[PDB]
Amino acid sequence: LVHVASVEKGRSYEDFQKVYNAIALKLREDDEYDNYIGYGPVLVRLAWHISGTWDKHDNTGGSYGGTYRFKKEFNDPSNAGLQNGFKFLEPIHKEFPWISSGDLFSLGGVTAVQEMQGPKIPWRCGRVDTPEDTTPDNGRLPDADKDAGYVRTFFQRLNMNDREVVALMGAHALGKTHLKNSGYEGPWGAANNVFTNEFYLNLLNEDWKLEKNDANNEQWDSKSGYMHLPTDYSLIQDPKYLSIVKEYANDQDKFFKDFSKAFEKLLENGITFPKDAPSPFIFKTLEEQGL
Template sequence: MASSAPRLARLGALLARQGAPATSLLSSQGLRAFSEKAGAETTAAAAAATASTGEAKSKIRGFQALLFGGLGAGFLYGYSLFTSQVPESGPLAGPPALLTSKPSTPGDYDAVRKSIAGVLDNGDYDDGSYGPVLVRLAWHASGTYAKKDGSGGSNGATMRFAPECEWGANAGLAVARKLLEPVKAAHPWISYADLWTLAGVVAIEEMGGPTIPWRAGRSDAPDGSKIVPDGRLPDAKQGAKHLRDVFGRMGFDDKDIVALSGAHTLGRCHTDRSGFSGPWTNAPTTFSNLYFQELLNNKWVVKKWDGPLQYEDAKSQSLMMLPSDLALLSDRTFKKYVTQYAKDEEAFFKDFAVAFSKLLELGVPFPAAKAA
């Protein structure tokens, strides 16, 4: 459950927008004054009732019931604001509040990093972290690039528009985009394209992964006219040839393919998104080489269920692999790198950092470096 501080911040913002003083519900002095005033008024009304007819007494009792009933309902409502989950829709819905003392200065990417790190942990989401879904957002925003014509890639942040935001491969990424809205509001000078890619970098680093080289310079497209055709992102149902086709289109080699596949050490699949279900490892919020160890050392059998073809470990039946994962074992060249990374985490971290940084920069028109 989220801490009370973000809830108080969200409540304060809501009251401010509605023109109501936040202290009306939060100040004990205000509550005491209101109660004393109400008590005085009730006493006066009761005195008048003594000298009046039975009908007047009935009216006074009705007033008292209305007064204290309203007070009780108000207190219950105020209490519910602090103790219940924020609804998915309605006046209190929205991204988590981001507490900042003042707006950041344009170009202060350290401030943006801190803001991103501040929204990662949430005990109510998946395994307790939004980190994996932010990595997926950065990946899918960048993985549409085609080296042949320079189309696609992270520049433009075109997933803000339909139909790209509605692609099956991007199902569930609205969670990540919504999560980053308060970060964008706190740092309005950063482009969505830079924010999404930086969020993936920060998530990896915060979850124990390598430092990823990242630089700013992406711009946002004004509309969806530059959206590329659907089908450029990897299909988990496919094998080695498909992986080489998809990653080769972007300019990656076999080592890059295996290194980038190592991002599956994070997160899990969801039946309402990809159709698949379950985590690849028992530590889905820690960036490590555990994915390669599980892939190489477990016996994988076909999962018996009503969903698409996927595999589960024969021993615990708690972990899963996709057809595209097992393709890394069936292909001799791919398996060579799987074996290397399973044994040498440092080598994996080094190669992943290079490949992921390259992925995030595909198609971005960075200014040419000045000659020394």
């Protein structure tokens, strides 16, 4: 498969800045979701899940085709709880009917990170909705109950290296696990809707205990009331992952720079951009526009 980026007809930077503004204004407004965490966290998880289906070997899956819109992908067990991010974005799609689903679902993740005080993420437009029979089969997204060798091998299918995996996993300072969605329960840290390097600091500084939860799964619980998954804990059990965790724990700007590069790569995998295509857009925040 080749998937060529095609700009929605007649749209410029200012049109996309309006879809960003509408998502950011509705984040501000619906601040009560999930005990006042807000929709920022589930929106960056939706953007990583519609992107994480990509297979570098045959170019199937990934964000291009917007296939989460179809029943097979939408009802994937690994996607449980993302229906709330969908429902949030749906009024926005009725208001800007011209934007493709992949461009909307992926820009939601970009808007969420930047409005949570994260780094600026360059974003490119051009994904095109593809038909229901291009929807990927369930089972391409990663299990939580596994080790650093599984993690390295999984992210090789999206050709992410070590540094990109550790930077990307830093998004697990956001939001929380919910028993009914994934069989895991608890927050990651204290500031769960502001983007910081907290994930790395907690993994290196907390006294973690392995315990079973009410779903019979194991997780790593700390005295402070925070939790982490076996796959997160992996990043300090592996010596190559561990020196990068340390690096981000000591330098949040280096972490913001590397997360920005790796998250844009994740969102752009499987997509070919012609060089007549516009440069990646850097969107201004509500606060930068005085709105």
